[PDB]
A paper describes a structure:
Naphthalene 1,2-dioxygenase from Pseudomonas putida strain NCIB 9816-4 (NDO) is one of the most well studied Rieske dioxygenases; it is an α3β3 hexamer and is the first Rieske nonheme iron oxygenase for which the three-dimensional structure was determined.
The C atoms on the same side of the molecule as the Cl atom are in the closest proximity to the modeled dioxygen. This results in the formation of (1R,2S)-8-chloro-1,2-dihydro­naphthalene-1,2-diol as the major product and (1R,2S)-5-chloro-1,2-dihydronaphthalene-1,2-diol as the minor product. The Cl atom was found to sit near the entrance of the active site in an area that is relatively open.
Author numbering:
A (entry chain B), B (entry chain B), C (entry chain B): 2 to 193
D (entry chain A), E (entry chain A), F (entry chain A): 1 to 446
Write the structure that this text describes.
Amino acid sequence: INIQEDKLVSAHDAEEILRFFNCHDSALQQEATTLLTQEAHLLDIQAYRAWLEHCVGSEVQYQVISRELRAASERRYKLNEAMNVYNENFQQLKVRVEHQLDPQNWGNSPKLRFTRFITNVQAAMDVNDKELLHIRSNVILHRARRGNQVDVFYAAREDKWKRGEGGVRKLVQRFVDYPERILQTHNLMVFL
Amino acid sequence: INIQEDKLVSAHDAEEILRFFNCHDSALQQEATTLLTQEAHLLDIQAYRAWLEHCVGSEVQYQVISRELRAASERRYKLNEAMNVYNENFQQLKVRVEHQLDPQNWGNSPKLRFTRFITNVQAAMDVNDKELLHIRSNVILHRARRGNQVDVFYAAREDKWKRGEGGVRKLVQRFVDYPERILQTHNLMVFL
Amino acid sequence: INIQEDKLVSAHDAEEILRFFNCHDSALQQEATTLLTQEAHLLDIQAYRAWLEHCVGSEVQYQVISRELRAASERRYKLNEAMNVYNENFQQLKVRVEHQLDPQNWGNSPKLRFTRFITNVQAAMDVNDKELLHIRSNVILHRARRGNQVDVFYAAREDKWKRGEGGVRKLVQRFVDYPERILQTHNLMVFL
Amino acid sequence: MNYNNKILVSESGLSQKHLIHGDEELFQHELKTIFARNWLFLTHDSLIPAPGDYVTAKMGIDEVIVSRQNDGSIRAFLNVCRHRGKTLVSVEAGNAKGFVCSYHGWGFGSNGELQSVPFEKDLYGESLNKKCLGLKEVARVESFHGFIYGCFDQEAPPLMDYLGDAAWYLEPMFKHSGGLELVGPPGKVVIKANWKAPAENFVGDAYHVGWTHASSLRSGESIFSSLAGNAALPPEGAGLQMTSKYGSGMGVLWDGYSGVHSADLVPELMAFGGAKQERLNKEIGDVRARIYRSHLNCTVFPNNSMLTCSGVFKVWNPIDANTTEVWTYAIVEKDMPEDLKRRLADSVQRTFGPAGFWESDDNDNMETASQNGKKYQSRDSDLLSNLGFGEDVYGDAVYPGVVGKSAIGETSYRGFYRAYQAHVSSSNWAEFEHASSTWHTELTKT
Amino acid sequence: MNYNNKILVSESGLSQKHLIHGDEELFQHELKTIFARNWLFLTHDSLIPAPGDYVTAKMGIDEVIVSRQNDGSIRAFLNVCRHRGKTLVSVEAGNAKGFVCSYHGWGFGSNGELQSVPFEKDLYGESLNKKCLGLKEVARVESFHGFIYGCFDQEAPPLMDYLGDAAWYLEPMFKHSGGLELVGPPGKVVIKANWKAPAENFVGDAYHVGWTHASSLRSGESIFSSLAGNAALPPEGAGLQMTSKYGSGMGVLWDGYSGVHSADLVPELMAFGGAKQERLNKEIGDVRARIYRSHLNCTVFPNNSMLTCSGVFKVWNPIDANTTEVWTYAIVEKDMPEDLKRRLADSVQRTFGPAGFWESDDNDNMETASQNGKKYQSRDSDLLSNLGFGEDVYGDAVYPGVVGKSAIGETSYRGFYRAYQAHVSSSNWAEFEHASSTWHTELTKT
Amino acid sequence: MNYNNKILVSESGLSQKHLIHGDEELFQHELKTIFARNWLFLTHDSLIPAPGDYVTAKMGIDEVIVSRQNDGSIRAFLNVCRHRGKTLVSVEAGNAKGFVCSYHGWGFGSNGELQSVPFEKDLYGESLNKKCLGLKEVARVESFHGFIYGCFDQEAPPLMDYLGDAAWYLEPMFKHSGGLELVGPPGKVVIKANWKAPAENFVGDAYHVGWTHASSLRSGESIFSSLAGNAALPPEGAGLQMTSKYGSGMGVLWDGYSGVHSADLVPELMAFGGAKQERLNKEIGDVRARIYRSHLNCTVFPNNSMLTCSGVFKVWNPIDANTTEVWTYAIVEKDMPEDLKRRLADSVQRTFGPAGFWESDDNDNMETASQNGKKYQSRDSDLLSNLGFGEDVYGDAVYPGVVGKSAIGETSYRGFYRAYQAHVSSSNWAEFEHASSTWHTELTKT
Ligand SMILES: Clc1cccc2ccccc12
Ligand SMILES: Clc1cccc2ccccc12
Ligand SMILES: Clc1cccc2ccccc12
Ligand code: FES
Ligand code: FES
Ligand code: FES
Ligand SMILES: [Fe+3]
Ligand SMILES: [Fe+3]
Ligand SMILES: [Fe+3]
């Protein structure tokens, strides 16, 4: 993509297009689909420890940002463009998991209900690290609790996955640029 | 999954994880995807008779439950945990289909519009019945009617499918534990 | 489908069922999935010029209709059943793309955020034109802007795709019968 | 609007202003004069049978905790902490000796008493008067054969007197059958209708059945099926209508013991009800034994409805003028075989639950009738309930109450709305009584 | 708020309080003094040409059924059953001899009469007075060259008189062209704006075009395209503005017959309009023949707007102070070739329909201007409409009405809001007339 | 409701009517008597350091543009065009010399002046008085050590005087530390709570921490962790509470410099704060140097809160009685290493941001307490804030303000609500002063 011509496209987004448009490996797309479907199943049933053990690499960066609204023509204002809703290493994810599982987490009774919908899966091996797998996918996440509270989240996920212990592919990076600037879901206390 | 460690996980949910984590058959996942996409197409165009004929086994149990909200720590209160929004045999499904098709079903004029989104498909053959296929999938169901009524349903489906007449795979069990306790969709008069 | 028996089914919808129920080609379904996922990626990052160049055929008809609500039993009133929310040739799509990219399109600052979810993909070659590919798919389209505006669109797409320049498959027809009669999304200014 | 003077319901209950289904100021006024004043359904013994068992329930827009006490009684309390007002209980049912607030940890007993306060000695010393900090208690809690009702107003008549002439009709099924059980949990769905729309429909609307439910009648093959599409009118003597001083009323469809249940339950039910009827003849007389196995469509004023024999039990919980949260339980006779109870409960939900195909037939009728009450040109229009007027009786030798001796009519609408208007225009129970001293005379005019 | 006394619109229509776009109490007051009092667009002959043809339409927040009678006339009725208030018709258009209610099956004729009641003889006997139970009828229904308007107020001026000086400008296209057709069905979209925001924009806002629509002008290459980004001001004599006693007004952009249509329709349209103009010179004179093929941006007070030549036809249906349901039809000249009619209709929707790229340019402007009317510090602020004040005339020898002889100005805002304020502060038509006895003098001050 | 007479807050701030968290009429009244009258947080120098830099901010329900002027000052203006009221700026931050309206293209300077009007000469001639058409300016804009506050009321006390006795506690961290920076952009989330619920919680609620945040305390291993599940009460002398004349107040937890930060930041922070404290001893004295590195939970009346040392900075932006938009920034000390600043900012969001696991513990508490204020049986109920009453002092030789010399109590609730009630019942600042002439005496009674 020529971003001088396609005026609305960011350099970052153009780079990610390039990644999937070349060596298409159908088998890889299917492996990636299985991997993400299984991850979502573990999360949906709130098997957070199993998620960490089976899906999350020790070197993970799990990051969800919220970008400040700026003018399309802005060229002078240079201050921090985004904040981190999440920017977690493995230990920080573990803290969040223990918080979910704590019997004095009053908000988790009655038990929450999660349903995740994973679509638009794309996969490509890294060019330089032949053991690094880039996976892109979109998620709709439905959270229901307490009779009539319903929150629906929507996001694109830029992932890197790598073979870890026992040869199991695990998440080493997730990046989400959350599309809604002001959340209308009470909080973002869900694992996208 | 160890549900003593993963404190939020139900025994039932842990059993279903186990089912798909073992013999992964890629061809089966794709067969299941086709089967569910075709079923959803028939339902979306309101071909309810065709749905019964092509998708639904004579021995079907079609069940959607609503679970009462109870404390996570509850161990004494033992009364009926859930009610059946649906718990239908084939004849009961047929009654519902005839009700939909009746020309004096005033609610069906003007004609309703349905759009279904099926994702997260997993498939595994039963261990003991090699002719029984377990299929898990999630659905978003959009129903629009009468200018400005829009209802969106979200659910996970635990299905069993089996080869019936002419060797066509048909639904012999669907189980949905509906995630929202109080419906905000006027009714649940849709086939999930 | 017998539409005399399946009373709620339109002749058009019955014809489209027939198309996918016969020669199932698994490889074709997967090619179609890739094609649509890549198209959605280009649209989501607002690479509208790239979308035209890579995804849209010179002979395209891009059509989204809104059907007037009429009685199920109506047989006499014969006037125009639908209007065209879109009914665009390539040049008309180009006009819309230039409108999106214009630096004086005030509504595009701050930059909009799009996330598309493509599901229920079916594909079948045309019987008479062996170079014409029929693709059916459903879309959820999430558009977020200006802090707290969120609009979600839902639709089924009946597409025809054909190999064009360089052998690249491109859209030659898209037809959407939009399911909500009165839009509750401020406008339908999105490419479904 | 001046509720002392405004004629919202005309003389004899013959009509009502359409605005009653749409006006939010009137909805707010109903919270005071209807919901804070009258008896409201809470739960059944069968759902909280053991000490410590509790459920949450709505009373109007308020939420209460309803708890079985150690002495076997039931007490109900606002689900609101006495410290800074947090909702105490977030579940629908359970068993506990008390409830601890998740904000600052105050602990209340199942008896509503403030039993513990974290670090009380160090923080409050002896200065916190816990005796005065018990949960706000529902003043009145009474039982009708296991069905538990609450009332915020200490001045209300006893529940039995409040049921008035309706009690006589309910007793064969509620008492003489050996008793009913409520099968939970209920279905719960929000509809965009005023609570009065389904309440009026269940209290007295047999007219709508053949037309509204044409498709369900034709498809399910239940015993009332001859009515589908108005193909046939019930024969003379097929039933009656009744209403009462405090607003409760019902229709009676003779012998319709299998009710809305599809052909799969008809023979079993018709056998069971007939057998019990034969035993009851000797105990309560032929007429009342027949009432036992007759289909009653009833509203217990204001917002609790039921279909006996069909076994449908409803609460129309008010949210705003065009929003109601519908709770649906099944009622079963205790001495039915357990397998029959299970199938009956599923059938209640199949027909009238969240995906109840019969109940679905009613949605557009209730929602649009309610929403039209907000429309400018309809606010001051008159909803009609004159069918059968001038043919009702009172004090009949066989059937008590204001009675229309016909299966289809609007007798029970008139009694419901007469009581409604007397409450809306009154400041307390004494004023309601004064406004109701000629209630049956008003209803039997012409 | 006291609407008799509150100055919501200042003298000569020079400014308006911003709260008018946000205040819900005023919205409710408008239902009475604007929507229940004035002429509102219903449909066109072309959409209900045959006996039995009907459509539904909004009149304010009310819904009506608009039906072609056997005698060729049109009558309109509230879409509300006379029994218990259910919405009678759930579709948008059709053909029928009557309408049966889905609740209890009452049957009304296309003439609004209550024609049948299920089991009337057995239930009501002779006691139901069906003659008094016809659907509530819209008092006034009149046509302007096929365009059908309704009014709930029997006291309203005839539609032709209500159009006042605006009629003269509309006639060349509406009458002398041989007649227009409305192409349905309309697009329908909800925007989060007050109905007055788009109404004021179409009645008199040429100023916004070059800036608001910069991108659409630059991208579509329509004939008004020189305006993109305020790159060029229209030449002197490029157009005029007008307004009238009862609030209707418009801008006139000379010769702009292809309007907003992209270059793909420009040559064909400019040829067609020019050819008809040449014929019309001999019939109605050069000036009026030129008006025929000139672009008129018009609001017919209160909430019907159009762009002639572009062929855009709008209803701004009110929902609440910050919610409007936008209906968009295409207008075509009857004697255009059918293929041109089809392409013109698609082009109307392409530019101004639900995905109209021009209309999209207006969204944020209308929505935020409306929503800001609720904000505390803006409620009592003044929206300005003073552009061109002191240069308007009345009684001109060539162009009737209050006229600003310039293409860009706020003349038509002033007339729209003068009429608006006279209605809001009046209890009936007689009071509006008294409040409007010096209407043109007020507008031409200084 | 008569706000002059209605006792919404009882004497000494001992209780408040629960309706204050739910009543929409009172919310509207607060827009006038709370938000239009008092000082509201806008931004920090660090976010608009250079000429032309601007941000948007809410002040109550109004939106303002806050702009750095060429002379180094800051001015703030309503984000509303002076022509027809369109929202001028649609972004959250940027740098510009002015703002052009997207409707008709009017151009305003960063100084609020109307600088340009498209085609002014041709359209308005010399008749548009642009000098009188500047953006509506916020009357008062003042800084507290870089933190910029605005007030619509010209009669307000200077910001420093408004902070009253709270300023003394804030100064060690805000001033003597060398200064703070605000790290943006903020997280933004809507909660279904009244703005007063989180405001009261941050101003004075240490009682809730061990119970509400049990899981976060147990999981994160922060320095306040001994409190988890009320396992331990803070030792005597662990802290104090204070409040002030104009409503601001805070808790002080001695030495808690690492605050809510997980063990990963504890050693680094405890080292940094201790080192600066040692330097500050010589400058401001031991007590104030200790306050610098002590955890302050503070609300600057009405709706700005913070946790010093933890570095959490909050704006509770009001939307309606049960809706609040929560803005969350991080505060850091300017002389911290940049890498520490970055990690501290992430940790603030990790704990108290949109996915803040601590802040999540508070959701149900705030939302249900607020929503219960609408429920009929709770409106007239009393929220209690009597903990510690009768033990507060004023004029202490060491700690200024109304002070409770204990770590856990409700001193700061009482001062917050005393000021709230004095504003709600007053028409202007002079009346508030008259209503507050014995403010500390009222708070220290018994
Ligand atoms: Cl099934 C039935 C019979 C008679 C009256 C009824 C009223 C309401 C619902 C069902 C009814
Ligand atoms: Cl296209 C056009 C010209 C002049 C005035 C207008 C007002 C509104 C919409 C379009 C207009
Ligand atoms: Cl971390 C902490 C300590 C003391 C009081 C607090 C009040 C509110 C939020 C956090 C607090
Ligand atoms: S609100 Fe319940 S203990 Fe404080
Ligand atoms: S409401 Fe229409 S027939 Fe009864
Ligand atoms: S509304 Fe801003 S220039 Fe007109
Ligand atoms: Fe019914
Ligand atoms: Fe415009
Ligand atoms: Fe907290």
